[PDB]
Amino acid sequence: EITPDLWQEACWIVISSYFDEKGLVRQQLDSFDE
Amino acid sequence: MIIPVRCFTCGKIVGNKWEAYLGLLQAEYTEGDALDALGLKRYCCRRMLLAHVDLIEKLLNYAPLEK
Amino acid sequence: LSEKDVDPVRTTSNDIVEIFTVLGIEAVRKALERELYHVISFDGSYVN
Amino acid sequence: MNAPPAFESFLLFEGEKKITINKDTKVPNACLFTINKEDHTLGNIIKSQLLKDPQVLFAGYKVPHPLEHKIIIRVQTTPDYSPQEAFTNAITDLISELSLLEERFRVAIKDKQEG
Amino acid sequence: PYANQPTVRITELTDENVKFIIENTDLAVANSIRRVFIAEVPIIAIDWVQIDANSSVLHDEFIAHRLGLIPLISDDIVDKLQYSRDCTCEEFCPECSVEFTLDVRCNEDQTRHVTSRDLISNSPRVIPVTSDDILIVKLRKGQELRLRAYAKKGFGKEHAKWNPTAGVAFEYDPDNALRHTVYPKPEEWPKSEYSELDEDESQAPYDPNGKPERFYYNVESCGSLRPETIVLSALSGLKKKLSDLQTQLSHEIQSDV
Amino acid sequence: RDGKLAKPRQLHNTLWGMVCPAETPEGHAVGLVKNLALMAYISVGSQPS
Amino acid sequence: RKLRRQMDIIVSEVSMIRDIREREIRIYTDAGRICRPLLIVEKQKLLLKKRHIDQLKEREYNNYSWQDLVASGVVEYIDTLEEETVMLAMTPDDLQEKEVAYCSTYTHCEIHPSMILGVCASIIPFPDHNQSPRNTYQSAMGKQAMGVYITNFHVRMDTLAHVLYYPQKPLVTTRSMEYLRFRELPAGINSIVAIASYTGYNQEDSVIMNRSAVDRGFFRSVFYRSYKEQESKKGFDQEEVFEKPTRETCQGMRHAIYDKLDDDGLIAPGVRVSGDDVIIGKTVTLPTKRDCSTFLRTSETGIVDQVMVTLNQEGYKFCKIRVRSVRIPQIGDKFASRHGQKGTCGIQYRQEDMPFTCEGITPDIIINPHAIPSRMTIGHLIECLQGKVSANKGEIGDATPFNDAVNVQKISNLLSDYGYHLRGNEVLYNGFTGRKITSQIFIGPTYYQRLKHMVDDKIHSRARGPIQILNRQPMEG
Amino acid sequence: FHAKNVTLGVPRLKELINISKKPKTPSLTVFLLGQSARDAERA
Amino acid sequence: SLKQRLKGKEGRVRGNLMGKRVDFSARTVITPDPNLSIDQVGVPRSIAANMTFAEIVTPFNIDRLQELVRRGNSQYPGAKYIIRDNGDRIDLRFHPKPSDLHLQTGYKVERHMCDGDIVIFNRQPTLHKMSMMGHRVRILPWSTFRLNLSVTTPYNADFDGDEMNLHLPQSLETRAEIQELAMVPRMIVTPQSNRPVMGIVQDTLTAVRKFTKRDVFLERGEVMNLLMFLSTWDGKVPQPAILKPRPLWTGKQIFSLIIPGHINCIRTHSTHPDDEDSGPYKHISPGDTKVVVENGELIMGILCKKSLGTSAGSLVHISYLEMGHDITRLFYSNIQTVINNWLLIEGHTIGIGDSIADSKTYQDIQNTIKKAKQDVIEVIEKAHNNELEPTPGNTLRQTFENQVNRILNDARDKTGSSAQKSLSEYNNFKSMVVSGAKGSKINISQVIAVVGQQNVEGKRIPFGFKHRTLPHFIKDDYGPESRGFVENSYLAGLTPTEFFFHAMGGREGLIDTAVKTAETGYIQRRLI
Amino acid sequence: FIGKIPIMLRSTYCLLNGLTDRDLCELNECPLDPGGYFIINGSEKVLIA
Amino acid sequence: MIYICGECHTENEIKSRDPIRCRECGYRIMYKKRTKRLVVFDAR
RNA sequence: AAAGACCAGGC
Ligand SMILES: [Mg+2]
Ligand SMILES: [Zn+2]
Ligand SMILES: [Zn+2]
Ligand SMILES: [Zn+2]
């Protein structure tokens, strides 16, 4: 249930998910929408 | 943009090998095997297709100026 | 300089104005020369 | 805007002489050859061929500036052997060598196909 | 004070590659032959391009640049044709140029690849190396490309479009016996494909009396010229340059004397 | 930017992970113009009700 | 913390701070706080389990994304002053397992340490092998690297649009480049770079470039300049008209040619225009006529690419004209790798003159070896070696800053399997003489960027030109 | 930066050139005549 | 207001009287041209065509100036304006003007710049008078200014987007004055420090160091090729150092021909140890160190920055003081040309192999680093249990930091020495360092062994957080890793905390560089 | 109506919000365009934090 | 004198001193319909 | 098209 020695894939997968969800300019869009 | 002919370093014809390279990648071969099958031995030629990015497909999405 | 067992000849200070008020103007000339040489030659560079 | 045209490495416009012969006053029997619109392809060939001559005391070539297309060849020869004659002999030597090499290469090519 | 006699052995001869060895010759001779392989070999390539309509996403000079780098079969008539500068006619004539015409319009929805096969030449002897297809531009439905081009005679000194060869491999003394290069650690250097020594030792022993000879060659053609005709034309062109130098030198000698 | 104070321009420990340590202009604006890290997010604000 | 993890009442943006010694607990909900996500560590184990990664691999058509990962209490947004009370680890597989006791109360773990870098600095391959000033220099120069800045540039009409002919994604890439969209819009071409002293024209920071490669489109680009003109009505009888002025209809007139203009005073695209050529013919009706036509910038010598005419806000005629000019890299252009190694092109040698390997490889760019020692860019050499490995292998090299699984020795062993010297060196033959170069030259493909700084835009000469109205001194600029 | 700290380089040059009334690090070296120079107790 | 018009910089006085924009001035990027002379400057054809020099027609030059006028402004070797005796201007740009092409004695014709013209070449900022020297025009293709690389040092230039000013004097008096005062050869030696500003730098210096060693033997053809690049060569080939079994000249033997006239100079190589002068072999120099030049011939020894560089008593300094400016300019140009063209044969490079040490060396460096970390831990523990006695004049924290810094500096020095002692003679980092062309010993140390401690404001990395440097470290952690000491080298790669600390150090350096600005410029302006 | 507020591109109230790559291409807008900037008088303006 | 519309790409002939409104679309942006005069390109 | 402001950038 853990990820040993497979971390190099998992960390970049979660980073990919993060940047797919938000993007690079999410700050400007969120501030303007608010 | 588009695959450039005449690999910069030596001048070998690589402008005709882009579609075949894409097909080889799409069906079975890895990048190295596809490049070997295309006969691109010197790494100057292999980096020519390997590093290429085909922006020509993206540019074709927009409607033309004249219909 | 007035204190006992303190050398009145070789005792100097890096500040310049007080030497003017104490040791005169030629002493200021020499002391300012020495201070400029120290600040320049500290890095090892040489100026004529 | 300052880029020279492509035909400045080989083409000669009006005025330039292909080869210019100037004597060298510093030493006896030495000459300076100035070849316009040429590069190391000819200079290295001439330098190498001239050194084969036992009567050549000095031989070499130089490009004064790569952005210009010029060669200075300095040849010094033993007494009673003009450097111009040495240059002519070297060029004729090169003609014979290249003709013989082409002849043998053509024979080898013909042998390789169906042989 | 005379020529040594070179000999030639040819190991591999294909439609794309020629592997030959030149023995018993000077280093400068082999080096200049290699240089002429690239620079001084005449060849036919597109140089004059006129575009009538270009609706493609690539600008006009981009398409002209791509066209000029397309090799053209020059195996035979490159010698018959004359340089446009030396030609008597103004502009271009069939005795000094070859006319190419391209006329492509994408009507179907699927993107159409404009390739070298779309180039139409007036003479059947020059074909843009199509007995895959060299891609020029991709056209979307509604885009059009019509142009007229003339191909001139040139060599590698002018522009790389007139380079008749791919990477020309040159090598002499594969086993480092002349010590022209010194390996700080000889054991970690891969042996050349022409190495003549056993795997146990690294380099041949030093030869104080030796000089560079037996120059290994590997000339890879671009398809515009057959790789044996590349070497033939290189030898002929170098001989012609040397003969012209001889004529000019003789004229200067008579004038000065 | 004209100010010769060097303390604000320095790279502070608090910039780890939030502001790029390397990317910064060179000139009078060194250290005063900061580019954001890849993962950094700016709080948009919320009512503390 | 439990509520923030479950996002029941407190959104993940809000931060909680417990100052233990000073007994203050501060909760901030105001805007403007800077924060980054961090994995939560319970005891010595992450809350990222295998099932989360398995679901994220299935992210497509699963409706499972980063937001659901946040809602599972696995990642957490921590600001700067909440980072005060947290204890982080570099990687779990290094700092969480039991060892010689350093710490055991790890409460959070970093996603990946390379996330500390910005956008421009993330494109640097092996940035941890570089001197920090060089990383800053590359981060500054990356904005100046030329390439396809946007895909719809053909429809944009803006001043100073630089577009590269053949951009290439780097042979040696960082895992962060995927999120920068750098693959789809690269800026620079991978180039066979031989770090050698050849003719002294690459000395100092300059470089020597292959003329034959340049003729093949290597680092060739386009410069788009846009011209806008406004028709207007200011005076009573004064008006702006788009038209082609004749020889004598207007009072003011310049010796520049006007024949290229159409009936409306606008040149159609496809017309070659040189310096002083007139772009837009516009006249002023003085209360006969005054010519206010727009001319080229001096010595551009471009071709009109696109001409657009429309109406402005007020409804007057508005014309934008984009002029394109293809600029072949000269010996004044500025080129920089991805490590702060910048320099101009000293001179261009053809393929014949450039040194060549046993295989006929001639370097596209030669840089002086003297740059490397003082400027301290070891990552440049490592990137060159990795590119030489990856071009032969067929894969794209991974230059993530902190890998611990990509050693220089490992790259060397990989290269030695392809018949090359394991350290990247390769014997070079002199281009001119053909003799072997006694030293073995370090040659390999390296990613280089052509910068906007080009000599044609910087060269200037003055001889009794315009003078200022007030000081009667030469103009400025 | 490079105790006995003394202003050096450009700030020291500014102090000397401007004849600053108050130097940042005004110091004064002392030399000893008698046994104070040799013996540490009298020093 | 008028006060605002007159007061500040760009005001009337400062901005229009002490400094002002000038005619006949050009500026563009610079690129290196080792094949130019010292006093020569490459000028693009367009710049030379725009900028003109007024010349007075005389019976001596009336034919040449008439030909120039006939060529007009179109062809480059032409003229732009003709000045009549009454002072009215005649323009050759607009139509041939056939009636006005006539030239008579007394007119002024403004011809285009041509080869051999004398110009001022400047790089801003101008710190000293060698930052603005008179050059000689040499027209070259393309659009970049080009200067010899020994001229790079006076201007403090580097060929990466550097941009240089070109001022053309418009009168014979000013041109002659600049020729006799500000020629580049006339400015070789500096009154500021009585040393030469110009020296053999970059490629030529390294190739000289490699070229001068005893092992350098050159065959007949190579010697002939090198000798033609000697401008001062008398045309007489010296007898080779070895005659049998084959003729072989030596690098020193050929370099002796470059030495002008009869120059006597004695220098020492960078690698010269201090044991040689004391013991035997003082004049034999087993490592071929030291330098002895007698009667204008390089008797023995290996050259480096200590001999050809910018230093008091250097070989070039002796050449200038003994022969003159023209001969020293020729000496510079000859060195550059012949040594670059020999480097064409030998070649120089840098790479991975030059940055990699032996595995034994890596183990030794790691052992030293581990020992240093253990010593630092011991010191920290001693301070924790209060046995650390504070040195007089320092607090407990001050003396603790002093001891830790001493341990770390000792470790870094030992690792650097260990790395350098492992460098082979073929290693190119060592070649550059011993040649003095670029780099230093600490550069090799940071390349191979240890980057070293990172400091902010002269102290180890401060506690930006609550008594901790980064969130990853425990509080009150004064160990080498937490406070900024970087164990890894650039070849090995820095850890993320070490990477961030190195970033902070580089930020400090960049701040210092961007500050090395207004205040020192103010010092310059106030002083003068 | 009290006035017109400039709209940051690709925000919620922008016309490009929620459009796919094909939709953006049909309107001659780059899909890769990150947005987050304002258009005033035809000029692309970005607010610096 | 022909301009090309930016949406429907239909050719419409308009002159000076009349407004910009492509027929059947009512669009305000036009393009210049690249000229017929030939321009020579070198293939370098 | 003058004179200002601001911004970004090169050395
Ligand atoms: Mg610089
Ligand atoms: Zn290739
Ligand atoms: Zn003809
Ligand atoms: Zn319409």
The answer, for K30 touching chain G at a CB cutoff of 8 Å, is yes
Instruction: Tell me which ligand sits closest to the C-alpha of residue I30.
Output: 1
Closest Cα in chain A, distance from residue J31 (Å): 13
Task: Report phi then psi at I159, rounded to 5.
Answer: -85, 65
Task: Domain of residue K39: give its range.
Answer: 1-44
Nearest nucleotide to I163 (CA to C1') is: L11
The 10 Å Cβ neighbour count of residue E132 is 15
H-helix or E-strand spanning residue I70:
helix I62-71
List the alpha helices (DSSP H) in B1-67.
18-27, 31-37, 43-50, 55-59
Active site residue G54: no
Cα–chain center distance at G166:
14
Q: Is E38 in contact with E163 (CB distance < 8 Å)?
A: yes
Distance G453 CA to L9 C1' (A): 10
CA separation for the pair I449, I467 (Å, rounded): 30
Cβ of residue E221 closer than 8 Å to a chain D Cβ:
no
Rounded distance, CA A14 to CA I201, Å? 52
Structure tokens at E210: 């030796």
* E139, E144, E150, E156 alpha-carbon torsion, rounded to 10°: -30
Phi, psi (rounded to 5 degrees) for I443 = -60, -45
Residue B36 CA: distances (Å) to CA of B33, G416, G443: 5, 19, 22
Measured between alpha carbons, how far is residue E66 from residues E206, E219, G162, G167, I36 in Å?
49, 24, 19, 15, 37
Residue G367 to residues G374, I29, I473: CA-CA distances in angstroms?
A: 14, 18, 41
> Chain I closest CA to H10's CA: distance in Å?
7
Residues with Cβ within 8 Å of residue G125, at least 6 apart in sequence: G170, G172, G173, G174, G338, G339, G379, G382, G383, G386, G397, G399, G447
Q: Which amino acid is at I511?
A: I
Chain I CB contacts of D3 below 8 Å: 141-143
Distance of alpha carbon E128 from alpha carbon I382, whole angstroms: 83
Q: Pick the residue from chain B with its C-alpha nearest to K3.
A: B66
All domains of chain E in start order, with CATH: 1-42+161-257 (3.30.1360.10), 43-160 (2.170.120.12)
Q: Which of I60-72 are b and which e, b meaning 16 or more Cβ less than 10 Å from the residue's Cβ? A: eeeeebbebbebb
Q: Which among A2, A8, A34 has the least Cβ separation from residue G50?
A: A2
Q: How would you class I266 by CB atoms within 10 Å of its CB: exposed for 0-12, middle for 13-18, buried for 19 or more?
A: middle
Determined by which method? cryo-EM
Q: For residue E133, what are the CA distances in angstroms to E75, E130, E220, I400, I488?
A: 19, 7, 19, 75, 52
Any chain D CB within 8 A of the CB of E180?
no
Kindly report the backbone phi and psi dihedral angles of residue G414, in degrees, each rounded to the nearest multiple of 5, phi listed first: -60, -45
Between D2, D48, D62, which is nearest I141 by CB? D2
In this structure, how many other beta carbons lie within 10 angstroms of the beta carbon of residue H10? 14
CA-to-CA dists, residue A7 to G33, G48, G92, angstroms? 30, 10, 8
Rounded Cα distance, E25 and E19, in Å: 17
CATH code: domain of residue D70? 3.30.1360.10
- Count helices and strands in chain H by DSSP H and E runs: 2, 1
Q: What angle do CA I166, I169, I174 make, to 5 degrees?
A: 135
Distance (Å) from CA E49 to ligand 3 centroid: 16
Tell me the nearest-neighbour CA distance from K8 into chain G, angstroms: 15
Query: CA-to-CA distance for A25 and A23, rounded, in angstroms?
Result: 6
CB contact I59 to E (< 8 Å): no
The domain in which residue D114 lies consists of 1-115
CB atoms within 10 A of CB J22: 9
Residue closest to sugar C1' of L10 by CA: I161
Q: Which residues of K are annotated as a binding site?
A: 5, 8, 22, 25
Distance CA E171, CA E192 (A): 9
Cα pseudo-dihedral G208, G211, G216, G219, rounded to 10: 30
What tokens does I33 get? Answer: 């041209």
User: What is the C-alpha to C-alpha distance for residues E73 and E226, in angstroms, rounded to an integer?
Assistant: 9
Tokens encoding J2: 């009290």
What is the b/e burial string over K19-44, where b = at least 16 CB atoms within 10 angstroms of the residue's CB?
Answer: ebebeeeebbbbbbbbbeeeeebebb
Residue G77's closest CA among G34, G24, G44, G28?
G34
Domain count, chain D: 1
| Nearest alpha carbon to residue A24 among G180, G123, F15 | G180
Nearest to I143 among D1, D66, D72 (CB): D1
Both tokens assigned to I348:
């120089």
Q: Which nucleotide in the DNA or RNA is closest to residue F1, CA to C1'? A: L7
Burial of J32 (0-12, 13-18, 19+ CB in 10 A): middle
Does residue I121 contact residue I147 with C-beta atoms inside 8 Å?
A: yes
Q: Which of E215, E138, E147, E220 is nearest to E178 (CA)?
A: E215
| G32 touches F43 (CB < 8 A) | yes
CA B58 to C1' L9, whole Å: 31
Token pair listed for J15: 């016309």
CA distances from E221 to B45, E78, E169, G212, I374 (A): 14, 15, 11, 16, 65
| Ligand 2 mean position, distance from CA B40 (Å) | 8
Integer Cα distance of G57 and D52 in angstroms: 73
Q: Which value, to the nearest 10 degrees, does the dihedral of the CA atoms of residues I49, I50, I54, I59 take? A: 30
What are the sequence ranges of the domains in chain B? 1-67
Burial of E50 (0-12, 13-18, 19+ CB in 10 A): middle
Closest-CA distance, H2 to chain C, in angstroms, reads 11
Identify all chain B residues contacting K31, using CB atoms and an 8 Å cutoff: 65
d(CA I5, CA E20): 80
L1 C1' to I238 CA distance, Å: 71
Burial class (CB in 10 A: 0-12, 13-18, 19+), G30: exposed
Class of domain I202-346: mainly alpha
Closest CA to G448 of B51, I203, F26: B51
**CA H33 remoteness from chain centre:** 19
The residue whose CA lies nearest the C1' of nucleotide L11 is I162
- C-alpha distances (whole Å) from G371 to each of G202, G376, I350 are 10, 8, 9
Task: Give C19's contacts (C-beta < 8 A, 6+ positions apart).
Answer: C12, C13, C27, C28, C31
**CA triplet C20, C24, C27: central angle to 5 degrees?**
90
Q: After which residues is chain G broken (C to N over 2.5 A)?
A: 287
Is I123 labelled as part of a ligand binding site? yes
Cα E117 to middle of ligand 3, angstroms: 26
Three-state SS sequence of chain K: CEEEECCCCCEEECCCCCCCCCCCCCCCCEECCCCCCCCEEECC
* Sign of the four-CA dihedral G454, E47, D5, G433: positive
Q: What gap in Å lies between CA I351 and CA G411, rounded to an integer? A: 14
Specify the CATH number for the domain of residue K10. Answer: 2.20.28.30
The two structure tokens encoding residue G41: 């560590």
G144 is in an annotated binding site: yes
Task: Return the ligand number nearest the Cα of B39.
Answer: 2
Please report, in range form, the residues annotated as the binding site of E for Zn(2+): 87, 89, 93, 96
The CATH code that applies to domain B1-67 is 1.10.10.60
Indicate the resolution in Å.
3.2
User: CA nearest D73 in I: which residue?
Assistant: I228
- Look up residue E134 and give its DSSP letter: -
Ligand nearest to the CA of G205: 1
Cα separation, F14 vs G82, whole angstroms: 11
Instruction: Answer yes or no: do G434 and D41 touch at CB < 8 A.
Output: no
- K9-13 contacts at long range (C-beta below 8 A, 24 or more positions apart): K9/B63, K9/B64, K9/B65, K9/B66, K9/B67, K9/E142, K10/B67
Dihedral angle over CA of D44, D45, D48, D51, nearest 10: -110
Domain count across chain K: 1
Tokens for I506?
Answer: 């580089």
Token pair belonging to E56: 């493609």
Q: How far is CA G124 from the centre of its chain?
A: 11
Q: How many whole angstroms separate alpha carbon I146 and alpha carbon G345?
A: 12
Catalytic residue of the set G79, G205, G398, G456: G205
Cα–Cα distances (Å) from D30 to D59, I234, I334, in that order, read: 10, 12, 21
